[PDB]
Amino acid sequence: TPLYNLPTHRACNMFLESYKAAWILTEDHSFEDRMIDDLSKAGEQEEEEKKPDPLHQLVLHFSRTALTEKSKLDEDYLYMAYADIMAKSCHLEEGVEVSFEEKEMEKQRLLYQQSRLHTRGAAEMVLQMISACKGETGAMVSSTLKLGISILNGGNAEVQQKMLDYLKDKKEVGFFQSIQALMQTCSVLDLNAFERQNKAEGLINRQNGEKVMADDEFTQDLFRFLQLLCEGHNNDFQNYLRTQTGNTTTINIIICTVDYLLRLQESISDFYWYYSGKDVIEEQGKRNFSKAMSVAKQVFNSLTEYIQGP
Amino acid sequence: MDILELSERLDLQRFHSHTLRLYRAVCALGNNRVAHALCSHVDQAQLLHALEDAHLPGPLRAGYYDLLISIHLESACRSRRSMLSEYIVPLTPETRAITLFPPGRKGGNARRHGLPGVGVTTSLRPPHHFSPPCFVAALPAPARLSPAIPLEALRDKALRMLGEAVRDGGQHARDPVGGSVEFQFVPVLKLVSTLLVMGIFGDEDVKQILKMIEPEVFTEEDLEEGLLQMKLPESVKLQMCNLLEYFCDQELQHRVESLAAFAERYVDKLQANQRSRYALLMRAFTMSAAETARRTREFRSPPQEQINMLLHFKDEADEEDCPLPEDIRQDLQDFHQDLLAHCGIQLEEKKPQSLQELVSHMVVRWAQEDYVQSPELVRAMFSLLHRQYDGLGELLRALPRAYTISPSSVEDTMSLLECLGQIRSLLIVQMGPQEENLMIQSIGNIMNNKVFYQHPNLMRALGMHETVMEVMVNVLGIRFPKMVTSCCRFLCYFCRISRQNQRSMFDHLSYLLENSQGSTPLDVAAASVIDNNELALALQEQDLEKVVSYLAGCGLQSCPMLLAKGYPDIGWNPCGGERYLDFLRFAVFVNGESVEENANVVVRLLIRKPECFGPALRGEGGSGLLAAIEEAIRISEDPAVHLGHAIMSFYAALIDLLGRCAPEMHLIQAGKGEALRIRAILRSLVPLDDLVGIISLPLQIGALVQPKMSASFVPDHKASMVLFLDRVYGIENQDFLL
Amino acid sequence: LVLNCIDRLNVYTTAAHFAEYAGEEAAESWKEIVNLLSELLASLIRGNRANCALFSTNLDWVVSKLDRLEASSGILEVLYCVLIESPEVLNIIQENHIKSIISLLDKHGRNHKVLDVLCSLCVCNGVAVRSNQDLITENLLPGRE
Amino acid sequence: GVEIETISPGDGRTFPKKGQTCVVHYTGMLQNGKKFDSSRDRNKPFKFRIGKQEVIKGFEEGAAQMSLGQRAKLTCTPDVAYGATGHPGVIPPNATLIFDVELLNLE
């Protein structure tokens, strides 16, 4: 009887941990859209030249924080939470019924939701944060790539135009340098860690499948952002990703994408070679194969978007 | 002259303001000795008079208020602010009597949350320990305390002045105190907030402050308008934001304490119910097939696994799978609904009636009215708004720092908390001898506490190891050698308390190995991986490569530290080699077995750098194992630490490591060509004749003259030889005779 | 180069005592050139952390050149900029520097920038330097003059 | 040494004895006219014991020869008080002290 006959404080602590893990974690919280709706109302019970609604002030504050020159980007929890709120105000609400009316109404609703905050400088904010990250992975850029994806979801022409105009006006190299560094830090299918994980699982590791790739979500987000940068056959932005006339140096993100694709292909071939001898692939091998094939599909889609719209 | 004459004399006013600034800066950051000394210059009476002086210039008024704060309350308020981030609620009877204070409180109708910051709290916070100032006492520093001022009179005075300022600000007087609204409100609001964080204000005083801030909402059920309804500048709005942040923190702490109080009762009820269920299972239930499914699936799992599934009653309404009676589930669901109502997520032109609504409306109104320019006010306003909108996430983030203890350990945990606060206070002081001694004594007192080894989870929640590691980073990045030894001893003892502590400390292995007699960071790194199969398997290749490179560097070049003392000069240092080889013995040999990957990689790195094997086993011109051992023996009996013993110790450690990296027997007998490749490499590295000769060395044994163990041959060296022989060579029939 | 020019110009103590070696026409411009050199020295490192860190090696020279009665107005600004931008030279400051600063305050009158310099001396970029604090307390407070 | 004088007469027959708590109200000043410490501004009396000095020697010797309210002006010279080590931010090293003390002890 290990449950009772124990000190009450130890049981209380265990119950607190289990209760926090099982009950308090509610899903909705019904606050992401309401905050953005409330912050978008200006001149309530009062009143152009004056700075509009608090949302634009918050975006300007974060843009100022990103614009300050420094050698490293500090981890700002407030920026993380607010960027997640803005991202979920559009993506979480608008990520059989194939009627023209319903589909077009959904498109207009998504367009309005994205225009609620991309007219307040969020497109500049995302670019500034990505450039200030200096090509260092972490939770600072994970919440920025997701926000940029949410704003650019569906291939917004206005957002793409604003981002390209900002990039061509600043003419500051370092955004594409950070993008290239982040792409170079992306992981692939590792066979050396697979055997270690298999041994560890056969008796904790504090997780499951956290050593093979562990960042496939980040890789998918980065490549989805790169693809959405030129989703609507944006010829100008497709040309910018290859050669930057205004900048003093060119990075050619397309070649970086193909290099990462070649690396992933080599990793997949090595995995197949390792699994050739066995007749039936076990569950853990299939999970890694699927999680690598998803990233391969994302890279292939990003490569297609560089060509379509000839 | 009169100090009020400085209103028209602007040349002396600047000098006096900067003199007060110098007074504050000299005694800043917990310099209680200078704080005591400054009481002879700026006495208590002068500060009290300047507090109530309505004709003082604004800069002088602000300077005097800040001087009083920085002299009498700064260090204690800093300590209390540091302690406020962690909740340690004991299971005292008043904690049991503590309720949620929900909308449905004692007197209420499920609508009123009460007033924040007023009530009963039980989280443990150490006292302030002030000391009276006196300049006539005899001269004797054991942590001089801050000068003492009457806190009750100061609190009453501050409340009276804040009320008077609030009343006078509604009349729109053309001569505000200090010459401006900011110079009238900010200096007193800072003092009020500081005393609020200090926990000096009582329940009635808290109610008075709440009424003064907003009487429409904070009252008990064109007429004395509150602070939030006036037109204030940004400097006053920042202080208002701090004041409201204090109340929000108080509400969160109350929520955590109430959750723990409910947890106590629920744990008691669940224990009683499970005891009754087991009694029924034992006495009754003798007619079924032993009920193995209803017994081994519930009463055989660990208590952590016995409580997670027991909480699957609701949230699905179709998957109970637990022996929980319906009434208990209803009670827990009622508490959950009450908690959700408290967090402002209730309900599945009116004036606000709760703190969250008032703060959100005020922040939105402030941002809508004017374009705020100061970044600090913008950040504070938006952080407060985010906290108010999302309270469940705030509770989720604050929960991991919450701990529950029995009332029988309060006295010991108070001393532990005081020592930790002393460490934190010392963390912001330039490194010095007195500071080093104080911090070492506090670390030792933390060590000797019985709480330290009884609640490792509480120690990890407080981040004690992180604080001690920050101290080591500060001292290392030599000076103060004793401090790093004390720090490494503390970390080594902390690692062995529990597996979770070792896992947490393993995350800093790269830093520990990079910065590599008493304890060493290398000792901490070794203790963070010792006897941990999962941690050993997770060890990175670069971590071993760094140690291999350090071993090669130490073997190739001798350390001049030993050359400084009386010792012969040689081109190879054995002590560093032995110390570096000690760590590698724990990353390849765990629980008597051997990890294949780590052993293979360390063997590869060792063979790719032959210099790590010493001057004997390197290559051409090498003397050999027997010759090296005999040369060390010959050195042992002539002047030429005591050199000569370390010469054999290094080789013994290297051979022990090489033997421990040998593949397992069943690996060899079941194919695994890489195992035989590694075995062949080890075979060709050193011959059998060398081992047989090494075991054959003779030993040396008025009274009998026994040679010193630290300056002569020791059979512990032969132990490595025997282990190596067993683990690669073995004996079947040939060597079994000689 | 600016340091060498200041050293050569400041060899002579006054504008008339062995300062007419170039002639009576250059006597009146010596003070102007010294002040301009001090201002340029202040401007070259004002706000630049790397320049202040590299210039911190001349702390003793800066402190010694604080009692010239014509170069103080610029040397004080140089010292303040060095202390503010690079808060690592604080640890290498002995008691003689603080005594010289207090002597400058006593001899040049009640200036409100000497107090700012002392405040910069007292506290580093987030760590309290108790040595400077105690030295200033012992050398300034007890004598109420 | 001690050069105790008289400001207001007391009783003359209730001198403090060994092992007693002496309660005094004192105002200290240097030999310059500059006051450095006082007890009346703190609105509390000062209590100290004989044989458990915890005070400068001159103050104890001056308070020894008092009688229930005899205001006195004690002159504590160097090598009788804080002395050459002085006090940081407080009396300089070589300076004598003048105390305006009043023994209002109520036993």
Side-chain angles (χ1 to χ4, degrees), chain B residues 615-619 621-633 635-640:
Chain B
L617 261 45
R618 30 165 203 82
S623 91
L625 220 51
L626 296 320
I629 299 297
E630 285 168 51
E631 187 130 54
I633 287 157
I635 297 297
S636 75
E637 35 269 31
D638 74 311

Short mmCIF file of all heavy atoms in Angstrom, two decimals, chain B residues 615-640, unseen atoms left out:
data_model
loop_
_atom_site.label_atom_id
_atom_site.label_comp_id
_atom_site.label_asym_id
_atom_site.label_seq_id
_atom_site.Cartn_x
_atom_site.Cartn_y
_atom_site.Cartn_z
N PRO B 615 55.28 8.91 -22.25
CA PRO B 615 56.55 8.81 -23.00
C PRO B 615 57.03 7.38 -23.20
O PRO B 615 58.00 7.18 -23.94
CB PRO B 615 57.53 9.60 -22.13
CG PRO B 615 56.98 9.47 -20.75
CD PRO B 615 55.48 9.41 -20.88
N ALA B 616 56.40 6.39 -22.57
CA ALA B 616 56.84 5.00 -22.71
C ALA B 616 56.09 4.26 -23.81
O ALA B 616 56.71 3.51 -24.58
CB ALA B 616 56.68 4.26 -21.38
N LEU B 617 54.78 4.44 -23.90
CA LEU B 617 53.94 3.72 -24.86
C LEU B 617 53.60 4.57 -26.08
O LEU B 617 52.50 4.47 -26.63
CB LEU B 617 52.67 3.23 -24.18
CG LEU B 617 52.63 1.77 -23.72
CD1 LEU B 617 53.92 1.39 -23.00
CD2 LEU B 617 51.43 1.52 -22.82
N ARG B 618 54.52 5.43 -26.52
CA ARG B 618 54.26 6.31 -27.65
C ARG B 618 54.68 5.68 -28.98
O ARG B 618 53.88 5.64 -29.92
CB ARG B 618 54.98 7.64 -27.45
CG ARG B 618 56.26 7.54 -26.64
CD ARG B 618 57.11 8.80 -26.78
NE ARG B 618 58.51 8.55 -26.48
CZ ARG B 618 59.38 8.04 -27.34
NH1 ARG B 618 59.02 7.71 -28.57
NH2 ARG B 618 60.64 7.85 -26.96
N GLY B 619 55.90 5.17 -29.07
CA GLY B 619 56.38 4.60 -30.31
C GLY B 619 57.88 4.35 -30.34
O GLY B 619 58.43 3.74 -29.42
N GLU B 620 58.53 4.81 -31.40
CA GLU B 620 59.97 4.61 -31.54
C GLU B 620 60.72 5.28 -30.40
O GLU B 620 60.44 6.42 -30.03
CB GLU B 620 60.45 5.16 -32.89
N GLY B 621 61.70 4.56 -29.85
CA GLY B 621 62.45 5.04 -28.71
C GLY B 621 61.79 4.82 -27.37
O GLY B 621 62.37 5.20 -26.35
N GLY B 622 60.60 4.23 -27.34
CA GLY B 622 59.93 3.99 -26.08
C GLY B 622 60.65 2.94 -25.26
O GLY B 622 61.15 1.94 -25.78
N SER B 623 60.70 3.16 -23.95
CA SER B 623 61.37 2.24 -23.05
C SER B 623 60.58 0.96 -22.81
O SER B 623 61.18 -0.09 -22.58
CB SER B 623 61.66 2.93 -21.71
OG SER B 623 60.59 2.73 -20.80
N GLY B 624 59.25 1.03 -22.87
CA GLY B 624 58.41 -0.11 -22.56
C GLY B 624 57.82 -0.03 -21.16
O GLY B 624 58.22 0.77 -20.32
N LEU B 625 56.84 -0.90 -20.92
CA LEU B 625 56.13 -0.89 -19.65
C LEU B 625 57.05 -1.26 -18.49
O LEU B 625 57.10 -0.55 -17.47
CB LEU B 625 54.94 -1.84 -19.70
CG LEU B 625 53.65 -1.37 -19.02
CD1 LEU B 625 53.26 0.02 -19.49
CD2 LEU B 625 52.53 -2.36 -19.29
N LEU B 626 57.79 -2.36 -18.63
CA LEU B 626 58.68 -2.80 -17.55
C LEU B 626 59.76 -1.77 -17.28
O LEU B 626 60.06 -1.46 -16.12
CB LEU B 626 59.32 -4.15 -17.90
CG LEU B 626 58.43 -5.38 -18.06
CD1 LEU B 626 57.34 -5.42 -17.00
CD2 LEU B 626 57.85 -5.47 -19.46
N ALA B 627 60.36 -1.22 -18.34
CA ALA B 627 61.41 -0.23 -18.17
C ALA B 627 60.88 1.04 -17.53
O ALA B 627 61.54 1.64 -16.68
CB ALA B 627 62.07 0.08 -19.52
N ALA B 628 59.67 1.47 -17.92
CA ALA B 628 59.09 2.66 -17.31
C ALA B 628 58.80 2.45 -15.83
O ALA B 628 59.10 3.32 -15.00
CB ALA B 628 57.81 3.06 -18.05
N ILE B 629 58.23 1.29 -15.48
CA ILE B 629 57.95 1.01 -14.07
C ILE B 629 59.25 0.94 -13.27
O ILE B 629 59.33 1.48 -12.16
CB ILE B 629 57.13 -0.28 -13.93
CG1 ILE B 629 55.78 -0.14 -14.65
CG2 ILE B 629 56.92 -0.63 -12.47
CD1 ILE B 629 54.90 0.94 -14.07
N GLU B 630 60.28 0.29 -13.81
CA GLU B 630 61.55 0.19 -13.11
C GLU B 630 62.22 1.55 -12.97
O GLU B 630 62.85 1.83 -11.95
CB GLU B 630 62.46 -0.81 -13.82
CG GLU B 630 62.07 -2.26 -13.60
CD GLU B 630 62.79 -3.21 -14.54
OE1 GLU B 630 64.03 -3.14 -14.63
OE2 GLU B 630 62.11 -4.03 -15.20
N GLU B 631 62.10 2.40 -13.99
CA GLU B 631 62.66 3.74 -13.91
C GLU B 631 61.95 4.56 -12.84
O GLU B 631 62.59 5.29 -12.08
CB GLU B 631 62.56 4.44 -15.27
CG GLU B 631 63.25 5.78 -15.33
CD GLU B 631 64.17 5.90 -16.53
OE1 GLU B 631 63.70 5.68 -17.67
OE2 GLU B 631 65.36 6.22 -16.34
N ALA B 632 60.62 4.45 -12.76
CA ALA B 632 59.89 5.13 -11.70
C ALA B 632 60.31 4.62 -10.32
O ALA B 632 60.48 5.40 -9.38
CB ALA B 632 58.38 4.96 -11.90
N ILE B 633 60.49 3.30 -10.20
CA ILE B 633 60.95 2.73 -8.94
C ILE B 633 62.32 3.29 -8.57
O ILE B 633 62.55 3.68 -7.42
CB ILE B 633 60.96 1.19 -9.02
CG1 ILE B 633 59.54 0.64 -8.99
CG2 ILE B 633 61.79 0.60 -7.89
CD1 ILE B 633 59.40 -0.73 -9.61
N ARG B 634 63.23 3.35 -9.53
CA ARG B 634 64.56 3.89 -9.27
C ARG B 634 64.50 5.36 -8.87
O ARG B 634 65.26 5.79 -7.99
CB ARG B 634 65.46 3.71 -10.50
N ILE B 635 63.62 6.13 -9.50
CA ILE B 635 63.44 7.53 -9.10
C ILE B 635 62.89 7.61 -7.68
O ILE B 635 63.19 8.57 -6.94
CB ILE B 635 62.53 8.26 -10.11
CG1 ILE B 635 63.19 8.29 -11.49
CG2 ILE B 635 62.22 9.67 -9.64
CD1 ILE B 635 64.48 9.07 -11.53
N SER B 636 62.10 6.63 -7.26
CA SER B 636 61.46 6.69 -5.95
C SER B 636 62.45 6.73 -4.78
O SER B 636 62.08 7.21 -3.71
CB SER B 636 60.50 5.51 -5.78
OG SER B 636 61.20 4.30 -5.54
N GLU B 637 63.68 6.25 -4.96
CA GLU B 637 64.67 6.27 -3.88
C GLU B 637 65.83 7.23 -4.15
O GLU B 637 66.97 6.93 -3.82
CB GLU B 637 65.23 4.88 -3.59
CG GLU B 637 65.39 3.96 -4.79
CD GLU B 637 64.16 3.12 -5.04
OE1 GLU B 637 63.05 3.60 -4.73
OE2 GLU B 637 64.31 1.98 -5.51
N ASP B 638 65.55 8.39 -4.76
CA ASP B 638 66.59 9.42 -4.85
C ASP B 638 65.93 10.77 -5.02
O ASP B 638 64.88 10.86 -5.68
CB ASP B 638 67.56 9.15 -6.01
CG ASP B 638 66.96 9.44 -7.36
OD1 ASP B 638 65.83 8.99 -7.62
OD2 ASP B 638 67.62 10.13 -8.17
N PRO B 639 66.50 11.84 -4.45
CA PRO B 639 65.92 13.18 -4.66
C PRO B 639 65.92 13.61 -6.11
O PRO B 639 65.01 14.33 -6.53
CB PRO B 639 66.80 14.08 -3.79
CG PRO B 639 68.08 13.33 -3.62
CD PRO B 639 67.69 11.88 -3.59
N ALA B 640 66.92 13.19 -6.89
CA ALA B 640 67.04 13.55 -8.30
C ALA B 640 67.03 15.06 -8.51
O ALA B 640 66.03 15.63 -8.94
CB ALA B 640 65.94 12.89 -9.11
#
